[PDB]
Amino acid sequence: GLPPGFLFGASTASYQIEGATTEDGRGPSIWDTFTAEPGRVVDGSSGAVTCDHYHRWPEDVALLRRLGVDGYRFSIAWPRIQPTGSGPANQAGLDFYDRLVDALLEAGIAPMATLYHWDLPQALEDGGGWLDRGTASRFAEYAAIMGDLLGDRVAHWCPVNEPNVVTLNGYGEGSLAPGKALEFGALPVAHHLLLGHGLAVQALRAAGARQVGTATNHAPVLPLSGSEADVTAASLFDALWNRLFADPVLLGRYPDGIADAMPGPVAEDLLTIAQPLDFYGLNYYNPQGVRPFDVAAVPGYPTTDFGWPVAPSGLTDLLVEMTERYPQIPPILITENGCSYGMGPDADGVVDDQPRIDYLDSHLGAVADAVARGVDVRGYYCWSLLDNFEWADGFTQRFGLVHVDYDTLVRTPKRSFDWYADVIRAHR
Numbered sequence: 511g512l513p514p515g516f517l518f519g520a521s522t523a524s525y526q527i528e529g530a531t532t533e534d535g536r537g538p539s540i541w542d543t544f545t546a547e548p549g550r551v552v553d554g555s556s557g558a559v560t561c562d563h564y565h566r567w568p569e570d571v572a573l574l575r576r577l578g579v580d581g582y583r584f585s586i587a588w589p590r591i592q593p594t595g596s597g598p599a600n601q602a603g604l605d606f607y608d609r610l611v612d613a614l615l616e617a618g619i620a621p622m623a624t625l626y627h628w629d630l631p632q633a634l635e636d637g638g639g640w641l642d643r644g645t646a647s648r649f650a651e652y653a654a655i656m657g658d659l660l661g662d663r664v665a666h667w668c669p670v671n672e673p674n675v676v677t678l679n680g681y682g683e684g685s686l687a688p689g690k691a692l693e694f695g696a697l698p699v700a701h702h703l704l705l706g707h708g709l710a711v712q713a714l715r716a717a718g719a720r721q722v723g724t725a726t727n728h729a730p731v732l733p734l735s736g737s738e739a740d741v742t743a744a745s746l747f748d749a750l751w752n753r754l755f756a757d758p759v760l761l762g763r764y765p766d767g768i769a770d771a772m773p774g775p776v777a778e779d780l781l782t783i784a785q786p787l788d789f790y791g792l793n794y795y796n797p798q799g800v801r802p803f804d805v806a807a808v809p810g811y812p813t814t815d816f817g818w819p820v821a822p823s824g825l826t827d828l829l830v831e832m833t834e835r836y837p838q839i840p841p842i843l844i845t846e847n848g849c850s851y852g853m854g855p856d857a858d859g860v861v862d863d864q865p866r867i868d869y870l871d872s873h874l875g876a877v878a879d880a881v882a883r884g885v886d887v888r889g890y891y892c893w894s895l896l897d898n899f900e901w902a903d904g905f906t907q908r909f910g911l912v913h914v915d916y917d918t919l920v921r922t923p924k925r926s927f928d929w930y931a932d933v934i935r936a937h938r
């Protein structure tokens with residue numbers, strides 16, 4: 511029971527699929543640095559080659575065409591555009607995205623471009639990365655470059671993927687690149703990511719961009735007990751994970767207490783952060799359990815191969831709660847949803863990933879349930895088109911509609927691919 515003209519897509523990210531890390535003048539990213547360190551990645555892998563989308567993207571565009579998605583969400587590698595994060599653009603970098611976007615348009619696919627999906631140029635990290643306010647300005651300049659090249663052709667833009675992850679995991683506890691562990695010392699990263707968001711929105715509009723939104727991770731936060739310790743920790747986590755990133759964008763304020771902990775002209779910055787958006791993009795996987803706080807899986811649910819709860823009702827609950835908190839929220843696109851399940855091709859070359867079908871089916875139903883309660887949701891993008899490099903978990907977690915063998919680089923559409931193509935057809 512989805513809206514007429516609901517958009518169906520699929521999503522990837524540059525470092526996770528492209529490979530070709532040293533080709534055509536690409537500069538090192540923080541993820542090149544992180545993956546070169548012993549013990550950072552569970553299986554000792556990197557994004558050196560991964561799916562090798564940089565050389566195999568025609569095949570991938572054709573898979574998207576066969577799938578029949580309305581939209582394809584991809585990320586631009588900043589280090590291919592500006593190897594050091596500043597200075598004149600690398601032509602070969604520009605050429606790659608330019609050609610990709612023209613091919614997507616020939617195939618009748620609406621391109622959704624993410625500017626920042628975590629691959630900061632190392633040269634910018636060397637100067638302090640997102641702890642430096644100046645990084646938000648470098649990001650704004652990069653936005654203008656990509657706006658100038660692609661502005662008239664990209665259907666949708668997402669400046670920053672999951673600023674909450676970049677902040678807490680990258681700089682707060684150091685579980686992801688760049689591996690800093692500042693705890694609350696990471697709050698300035700949040701402010702500069704959000705400032706970067708707002709400046710990029712301006713840059714893209716001035717370049718003639720079409721629709722500009724977000725791609726922020728959101729989850730209902732469930733207290734694991736009744737203890738105040740636990741309800742207060744869950745409230746705190748909700749304030750840090752959800753509100754810290756949505757309140758500034760959608761209301762032009764920080765949650766109570768936070769503005770006074772942020773550097774710079776915060777009031778003026780919040781005007782820059784709160785640029786009007788065409789859509790609000792969110793990434794949803796599952797509710798988060800919480801007990802200054804500790805995050806654990808909510809009990810009682812079946813789990814994916816990543817140990818994550820399968821809890822589609824949490825998506826309905828979230829979409830309803832977001833609409834309550836932010837009545838003026840623009841149309842919502844689900845910019846990512848998906849699941850890790852490890853099955854690969856059997857003796858006959860079939861990948862029977864029925865658990866992935868079940869997950870995606872139930873989540874689409876959860877979107878329909880929120881729509882039925884008056885939530886304005888306009889599309890859904892499956893993470894991912896391809897099995898890919900899952901950050902610190904390497905190649906051990908497969909999220910694809912399409913199986914990728916990392917030795918032969920063969921793509922095999924899974925059962926879920928065929929299922930999704932049928933859903934999309936039925937809905938038209």
Ligand SMILES: OC[C@H]1O[C@@H](O)[C@H](O)[C@@H](O)[C@@H]1O
Pocket residue numbers: 795796797798799806807808817818819
């Ligand atoms: O169940 C908790 C898990 O849920 C997920 O969706 C998050 O991405 C993980 O960071 C978290 O550990």
Ligand SMILES: OC[C@H]1O[C@@H](O)[C@H](O)[C@@H](O)[C@@H]1O
Pocket residue numbers: 523526671672727793846893900
């Ligand atoms: O963890 C699974 C997926 O979660 C998302 O939040 C990220 O944007 C993806 O890059 C990642 O592969």
